[PDB]
Design a binder for this molecule. Structure first.
Ligand SMILES: Cc1cc(-c2cc(NC(=O)c3ccc(CN4CCN(C)CC4)cc3)[nH]n2)ccc1NC(=O)Nc1cc(C(C)C)on1
Length: 285
Protein backbone atom coordinates (compact mmCIF):
# COMPACT_ATOMS: atom_id res chain seq x y z
CA UNK A 1 0.00 0.00 0.00
CA UNK A 2 1.38 3.44 -1.02
CA UNK A 3 0.67 4.91 2.45
CA UNK A 4 2.02 2.27 4.79
CA UNK A 5 5.74 3.05 4.69
CA UNK A 6 5.33 6.72 5.67
CA UNK A 7 2.61 6.15 8.28
CA UNK A 8 4.59 3.34 9.90
CA UNK A 9 7.73 5.45 10.31
CA UNK A 10 5.89 8.60 11.42
CA UNK A 11 3.19 7.15 13.69
CA UNK A 12 3.31 4.83 16.69
CA UNK A 13 0.93 2.22 18.08
CA UNK A 14 1.34 4.07 21.38
CA UNK A 15 -0.49 6.96 19.71
CA UNK A 16 -3.57 4.71 19.62
CA UNK A 17 -5.68 4.70 22.79
CA UNK A 18 -6.39 1.07 23.69
CA UNK A 19 -9.88 0.81 25.20
CA UNK A 20 -10.56 -2.16 27.51
CA UNK A 21 -12.94 -4.51 25.70
CA UNK A 22 -15.19 -4.71 28.78
CA UNK A 23 -15.91 -1.00 28.32
CA UNK A 24 -17.19 -1.50 24.75
CA UNK A 25 -20.78 -2.46 23.97
CA UNK A 26 -22.09 -3.09 20.46
CA UNK A 27 -25.60 -1.68 20.04
CA UNK A 28 -26.65 -2.33 16.45
CA UNK A 29 -25.37 -3.03 12.95
CA UNK A 30 -24.98 -0.13 10.52
CA UNK A 31 -23.41 -1.72 7.45
CA UNK A 32 -18.64 -4.93 9.58
CA UNK A 33 -19.59 -1.61 11.15
CA UNK A 34 -21.68 -1.25 14.28
CA UNK A 35 -22.97 1.55 16.44
CA UNK A 36 -21.25 1.05 19.78
CA UNK A 37 -20.87 2.67 23.18
CA UNK A 38 -17.87 3.34 25.41
CA UNK A 39 -18.52 3.65 29.14
CA UNK A 40 -17.65 2.53 32.65
CA UNK A 41 -20.85 7.34 27.92
CA UNK A 42 -19.47 7.86 24.41
CA UNK A 43 -21.31 7.05 21.18
CA UNK A 44 -19.06 5.56 18.50
CA UNK A 45 -18.88 3.54 15.31
CA UNK A 46 -16.99 0.24 15.54
CA UNK A 47 -15.16 -1.48 12.70
CA UNK A 48 -14.37 -5.14 13.36
CA UNK A 49 -11.61 -7.42 12.10
CA UNK A 50 -12.86 -10.95 11.36
CA UNK A 51 -11.00 -13.48 13.54
CA UNK A 52 -10.41 -15.62 10.45
CA UNK A 53 -8.01 -13.33 8.59
CA UNK A 54 -4.53 -13.17 7.08
CA UNK A 55 -1.49 -11.43 8.57
CA UNK A 56 -1.93 -8.91 5.76
CA UNK A 57 -5.43 -8.06 6.98
CA UNK A 58 -3.94 -7.72 10.46
CA UNK A 59 -1.58 -5.13 9.00
CA UNK A 60 -4.31 -3.45 6.94
CA UNK A 61 -6.45 -3.18 10.06
CA UNK A 62 -3.70 -1.60 12.16
CA UNK A 63 -2.68 0.76 9.35
CA UNK A 64 -6.22 2.08 8.93
CA UNK A 65 -6.21 3.18 12.57
CA UNK A 66 -2.70 4.64 12.32
CA UNK A 67 -3.45 6.57 9.13
CA UNK A 68 -6.74 8.06 10.37
CA UNK A 69 -5.10 8.98 13.71
CA UNK A 70 -2.45 11.06 11.89
CA UNK A 71 -5.10 13.53 10.79
CA UNK A 72 -6.68 16.40 12.68
CA UNK A 73 -9.36 18.17 10.65
CA UNK A 74 -13.10 18.75 11.10
CA UNK A 75 -13.96 17.39 7.63
CA UNK A 76 -12.05 14.12 8.09
CA UNK A 77 -13.55 11.34 10.22
CA UNK A 78 -11.87 10.81 13.59
CA UNK A 79 -10.36 7.66 15.03
CA UNK A 80 -11.56 7.57 18.62
CA UNK A 81 -9.39 4.68 19.74
CA UNK A 82 -8.93 0.95 19.31
CA UNK A 83 -9.31 -2.41 21.03
CA UNK A 84 -6.68 -4.60 19.40
CA UNK A 85 -5.83 -6.70 22.46
CA UNK A 86 -9.09 -8.67 22.28
CA UNK A 87 -10.70 -10.80 19.55
CA UNK A 88 -12.35 -9.79 17.33
CA UNK A 89 -10.26 -6.61 17.13
CA UNK A 90 -12.03 -3.22 17.03
CA UNK A 91 -11.34 0.21 15.62
CA UNK A 92 -13.38 2.92 17.33
CA UNK A 93 -14.49 5.63 14.92
CA UNK A 94 -16.43 8.89 14.85
CA UNK A 95 -20.14 8.07 14.64
CA UNK A 96 -21.78 9.85 11.71
CA UNK A 97 -25.53 9.68 12.29
CA UNK A 98 -26.29 11.08 8.84
CA UNK A 99 -24.92 8.00 7.11
CA UNK A 100 -23.21 7.96 3.72
CA UNK A 101 -23.69 10.93 1.38
CA UNK A 102 -24.92 8.90 -1.60
CA UNK A 103 -27.77 7.34 0.38
CA UNK A 104 -28.56 10.75 1.87
CA UNK A 105 -28.86 12.40 -1.55
CA UNK A 106 -31.16 9.69 -2.92
CA UNK A 107 -33.39 9.56 0.16
CA UNK A 108 -33.64 13.36 0.48
CA UNK A 109 -34.48 14.19 -3.14
CA UNK A 110 -37.26 16.79 -3.38
CA UNK A 111 -40.54 14.90 -3.76
CA UNK A 112 -44.01 16.42 -4.29
CA UNK A 113 -37.98 21.98 0.88
CA UNK A 114 -35.94 18.92 1.80
CA UNK A 115 -32.78 20.31 0.18
CA UNK A 116 -31.69 23.58 -1.43
CA UNK A 117 -28.79 24.50 -3.70
CA UNK A 118 -26.86 26.08 -0.81
CA UNK A 119 -27.05 22.81 1.13
CA UNK A 120 -25.36 20.99 -1.74
CA UNK A 121 -22.68 23.68 -1.98
CA UNK A 122 -21.93 23.37 1.74
CA UNK A 123 -21.50 19.60 1.41
CA UNK A 124 -19.18 20.14 -1.56
CA UNK A 125 -17.31 22.80 0.42
CA UNK A 126 -16.97 20.50 3.43
CA UNK A 127 -15.44 17.70 1.35
CA UNK A 128 -13.26 20.10 -0.64
CA UNK A 129 -11.96 21.49 2.65
CA UNK A 130 -10.99 18.01 3.82
CA UNK A 131 -9.38 17.20 0.48
CA UNK A 132 -7.27 20.37 0.67
CA UNK A 133 -6.07 19.28 4.10
CA UNK A 134 -5.21 15.82 2.78
CA UNK A 135 -3.42 17.35 -0.21
CA UNK A 136 -1.49 19.73 2.05
CA UNK A 137 -0.35 16.68 4.02
CA UNK A 138 0.53 14.77 0.84
CA UNK A 139 -2.10 12.06 1.30
CA UNK A 140 -3.72 10.60 -1.83
CA UNK A 141 -7.19 9.22 -1.13
CA UNK A 142 -7.69 7.26 -4.37
CA UNK A 143 -11.40 6.75 -3.90
CA UNK A 144 -13.15 10.10 -3.53
CA UNK A 145 -16.83 9.35 -4.06
CA UNK A 146 -20.18 10.05 -2.40
CA UNK A 147 -20.24 6.51 -0.99
CA UNK A 148 -17.15 7.38 1.09
CA UNK A 149 -18.45 10.72 2.41
CA UNK A 150 -20.32 10.73 5.73
CA UNK A 151 -22.75 13.18 7.35
CA UNK A 152 -23.02 14.07 11.04
CA UNK A 153 -26.80 14.44 10.82
CA UNK A 154 -29.57 14.82 8.22
CA UNK A 155 -31.09 18.18 9.16
CA UNK A 156 -29.67 21.72 8.82
CA UNK A 157 -26.24 22.16 10.39
CA UNK A 158 -25.12 18.84 8.93
CA UNK A 159 -21.38 18.48 8.33
CA UNK A 160 -19.92 16.27 5.61
CA UNK A 161 -16.64 14.45 6.20
CA UNK A 162 -14.25 12.30 4.17
CA UNK A 163 -13.81 8.65 5.08
CA UNK A 164 -13.12 5.39 3.29
CA UNK A 165 -15.24 2.25 3.53
CA UNK A 166 -12.38 0.48 1.76
CA UNK A 167 -14.45 -1.25 -0.94
CA UNK A 168 -11.55 -0.51 -3.32
CA UNK A 169 -10.22 -4.66 -13.28
CA UNK A 170 -13.90 -5.41 -12.63
CA UNK A 171 -13.36 -3.90 -9.18
CA UNK A 172 -11.84 -0.58 -10.29
CA UNK A 173 -14.17 2.40 -9.74
CA UNK A 174 -13.48 3.48 -13.33
CA UNK A 175 -16.33 6.00 -13.34
CA UNK A 176 -14.45 8.08 -10.73
CA UNK A 177 -11.00 7.73 -12.31
CA UNK A 178 -9.00 9.95 -14.71
CA UNK A 179 -7.34 8.44 -17.82
CA UNK A 180 -3.83 8.27 -16.33
CA UNK A 181 -5.29 6.37 -13.39
CA UNK A 182 -7.20 3.62 -15.23
CA UNK A 183 -4.69 3.45 -18.12
CA UNK A 184 -1.37 3.72 -16.27
CA UNK A 185 -2.14 3.20 -12.58
CA UNK A 186 -0.80 6.68 -11.85
CA UNK A 187 -2.23 8.28 -8.70
CA UNK A 188 -1.51 11.85 -7.60
CA UNK A 189 -3.32 14.71 -5.96
CA UNK A 190 -4.64 15.63 -9.40
CA UNK A 191 -6.28 12.23 -9.75
CA UNK A 192 -8.15 13.00 -6.52
CA UNK A 193 -9.15 16.27 -8.21
CA UNK A 194 -10.75 14.34 -11.07
CA UNK A 195 -12.64 12.13 -8.63
CA UNK A 196 -13.88 15.17 -6.72
CA UNK A 197 -15.30 16.45 -10.00
CA UNK A 198 -17.31 13.25 -10.32
CA UNK A 199 -18.38 13.63 -6.67
CA UNK A 200 -19.63 17.14 -7.48
CA UNK A 201 -21.71 15.58 -10.25
CA UNK A 202 -23.11 13.02 -7.79
CA UNK A 203 -24.04 15.79 -5.37
CA UNK A 204 -25.79 18.09 -7.83
CA UNK A 205 -27.48 15.21 -9.64
CA UNK A 206 -28.82 14.35 -6.18
CA UNK A 207 -27.22 10.91 -6.03
CA UNK A 208 -27.35 9.52 -9.57
CA UNK A 209 -24.85 6.95 -10.86
CA UNK A 210 -22.22 8.77 -12.96
CA UNK A 211 -22.40 8.25 -16.74
CA UNK A 212 -25.96 6.96 -16.16
CA UNK A 213 -26.49 4.86 -19.31
CA UNK A 214 -22.92 3.55 -19.54
CA UNK A 215 -20.99 0.48 -18.41
CA UNK A 216 -17.43 0.74 -17.10
CA UNK A 217 -15.84 -0.22 -20.43
CA UNK A 218 -18.10 2.23 -22.25
CA UNK A 219 -17.02 4.98 -19.85
CA UNK A 220 -13.38 3.95 -20.34
CA UNK A 221 -13.61 4.44 -24.11
CA UNK A 222 -15.84 7.51 -23.73
CA UNK A 223 -13.46 9.36 -21.39
CA UNK A 224 -10.25 8.39 -23.21
CA UNK A 225 -11.76 9.85 -26.40
CA UNK A 226 -12.43 13.17 -24.64
CA UNK A 227 -16.05 12.53 -23.66
CA UNK A 228 -17.43 14.13 -20.50
CA UNK A 229 -20.72 14.07 -18.58
CA UNK A 230 -23.40 16.68 -19.23
CA UNK A 231 -24.45 18.97 -16.39
CA UNK A 232 -26.83 17.47 -13.83
CA UNK A 233 -30.41 18.71 -14.22
CA UNK A 234 -30.73 22.40 -13.26
CA UNK A 235 -27.04 22.51 -12.33
CA UNK A 236 -25.80 26.12 -12.22
CA UNK A 237 -23.19 26.99 -14.84
CA UNK A 238 -20.54 28.08 -12.30
CA UNK A 239 -20.84 24.69 -10.57
CA UNK A 240 -20.62 22.70 -13.82
CA UNK A 241 -17.54 24.68 -14.79
CA UNK A 242 -15.80 23.44 -11.65
CA UNK A 243 -16.58 19.87 -12.72
CA UNK A 244 -15.22 20.35 -16.24
CA UNK A 245 -12.10 21.91 -14.80
CA UNK A 246 -11.61 18.88 -12.56
CA UNK A 247 -11.93 16.71 -15.69
CA UNK A 248 -9.17 18.30 -17.77
CA UNK A 249 -7.43 15.49 -19.63
CA UNK A 250 -3.93 16.43 -18.44
CA UNK A 251 -3.47 16.53 -14.64
CA UNK A 252 -1.34 19.67 -15.02
CA UNK A 253 -4.46 21.49 -16.24
CA UNK A 254 -6.63 20.42 -13.30
CA UNK A 255 -7.02 22.76 -10.30
CA UNK A 256 -5.69 21.92 -6.84
CA UNK A 257 -8.12 21.76 -3.93
CA UNK A 258 -7.24 25.25 -2.71
CA UNK A 259 -8.51 26.64 -6.02
CA UNK A 260 -11.51 24.29 -6.05
CA UNK A 261 -12.41 25.43 -2.54
CA UNK A 262 -12.17 29.10 -3.56
CA UNK A 263 -14.42 28.53 -6.55
CA UNK A 264 -17.03 26.63 -4.52
CA UNK A 265 -17.03 29.49 -2.02
CA UNK A 266 -17.55 32.00 -4.84
CA UNK A 267 -20.63 30.01 -5.92
CA UNK A 268 -22.17 30.38 -2.46
CA UNK A 269 -21.77 34.15 -2.84
CA UNK A 270 -23.87 34.18 -6.02
CA UNK A 271 -27.63 34.60 -5.44
CA UNK A 272 -28.34 33.37 -8.98
CA UNK A 273 -26.63 30.10 -8.03
CA UNK A 274 -28.05 29.50 -4.56
CA UNK A 275 -31.60 30.57 -5.50
CA UNK A 276 -31.72 28.00 -8.31
CA UNK A 277 -34.40 25.37 -7.70
CA UNK A 278 -33.49 21.69 -7.54
CA UNK A 279 -35.55 19.39 -9.79
CA UNK A 280 -38.64 17.60 -8.43
CA UNK A 281 -39.35 14.00 -9.35
CA UNK A 282 -43.10 13.22 -9.69
CA UNK A 283 -43.77 9.56 -8.85
CA UNK A 284 -45.58 8.41 -12.02
CA UNK A 285 -42.58 9.64 -14.06
C1 LIG B 1 -15.37 2.14 7.88
C2 LIG B 1 -15.64 3.46 8.56
C3 LIG B 1 -17.05 3.78 9.02
C4 LIG B 1 -17.31 5.09 9.71
C5 LIG B 1 -18.69 5.48 10.16
C6 LIG B 1 -19.88 5.08 9.61
C7 LIG B 1 -20.87 5.71 10.32
N1 LIG B 1 -22.28 5.65 10.15
C8 LIG B 1 -22.97 4.70 9.32
O1 LIG B 1 -22.38 3.86 8.68
C9 LIG B 1 -24.49 4.84 9.24
C10 LIG B 1 -25.16 5.87 10.11
C11 LIG B 1 -26.66 6.05 10.05
C12 LIG B 1 -27.50 5.22 9.11
C13 LIG B 1 -29.00 5.42 9.04
N2 LIG B 1 -29.24 6.29 8.10
C14 LIG B 1 -29.11 7.60 8.45
C15 LIG B 1 -30.41 8.26 8.86
N3 LIG B 1 -31.41 8.04 7.98
C16 LIG B 1 -32.51 8.56 8.40
C17 LIG B 1 -31.57 6.71 7.75
C18 LIG B 1 -30.28 6.06 7.27
C19 LIG B 1 -26.81 4.19 8.22
C20 LIG B 1 -25.30 4.01 8.28
N4 LIG B 1 -20.29 6.48 11.25
N5 LIG B 1 -18.93 6.35 11.16
C21 LIG B 1 -16.20 6.10 9.94
C22 LIG B 1 -14.79 5.77 9.49
C23 LIG B 1 -14.53 4.46 8.80
N6 LIG B 1 -13.20 4.17 8.39
C24 LIG B 1 -12.50 5.11 7.59
O2 LIG B 1 -13.04 6.15 7.25
N7 LIG B 1 -11.18 4.75 7.20
C25 LIG B 1 -10.35 5.61 6.43
C26 LIG B 1 -10.48 6.97 6.28
C27 LIG B 1 -9.46 7.41 5.49
C28 LIG B 1 -9.22 8.83 5.05
C29 LIG B 1 -8.60 8.82 3.67
C30 LIG B 1 -8.26 9.48 6.02
O3 LIG B 1 -8.69 6.34 5.17
N8 LIG B 1 -9.25 5.22 5.77
Amino acid sequence: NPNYSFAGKTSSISDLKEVPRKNITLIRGLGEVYEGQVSGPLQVAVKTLPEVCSEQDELDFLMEALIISKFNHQNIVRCIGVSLQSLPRFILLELMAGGDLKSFLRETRPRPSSLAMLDLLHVARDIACGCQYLEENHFIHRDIAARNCLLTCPGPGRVAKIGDFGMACAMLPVKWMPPEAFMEGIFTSKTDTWSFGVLLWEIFSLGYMPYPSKSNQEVLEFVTSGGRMDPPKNCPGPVYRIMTQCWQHQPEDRPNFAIILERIEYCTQDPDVINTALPIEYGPL
